[PDB]
Design a protein around this ligand. Structure first.
Ligand SMILES: Cc1cc(/N=N/c2ccc(S(=O)(=O)Nc3ccccn3)cc2)c(N)cc1O
Length: 123
């Protein structure tokens, strides 16, 4: 496995916004507690899971464990950066896996919920 994505940025300034607070306390928390969250709570462990070619296929890995730590560490300056990371996580699943796969159905359920929660992101 590669190192996990960075979760801190020392050369960056930090802020908190209402949108960032919402992304952590509402969006991330709600997805985290979904019945299908567990495969998405940490980086894909291709060695342990014996996933052929995962990191040959997926060059931009992302997961909710990483997103959570980024939020907790005020890694994101712009809310969009966080939204993009969720989207990368879902897209990776669709790149690597096939229609009907259990992991795809799980991703789909999480994405649906994500969209519901981002729809209610405060202005
Ligand atoms: C994001 C992602 C995760 C995957 N698999 N994740 C797993 C996590 C845990 C297990 S397990 O073997 O540790 N636990 C299981 C496996 C099956 C049934 C119940 N528990 C298996 C796959 C997978 N493939 C493809 C993907 O694109």
């Amino acid at each position: 496995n590669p190192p996990p994505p960075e979760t801190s940025n020392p050369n960056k300034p930090k802020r908190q916004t209402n949108q960032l607070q919402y992304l952590l306390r509402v969006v991330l928390k709600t997805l985290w507690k979904h019945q299908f969250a567990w495969p998405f709570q940490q980086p894909v462990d291709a060695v342990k899971l014996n996933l052929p070619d995962y990191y040959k296929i997926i060059k931009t890995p992302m997961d909710m464990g990483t997103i959570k730590k980024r939020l907790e560490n005020n890694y994101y300056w712009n809310a969009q950066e966080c939204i993009q990371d969720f989207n990368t996580m879902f897209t990776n699943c669709y790149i690597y896996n096939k229609p009907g796969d259990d992991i795809v159905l799980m991703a789909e359920a999480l994405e649906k919920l994500f969209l519901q929660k981002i729809n209610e992101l405060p202005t």
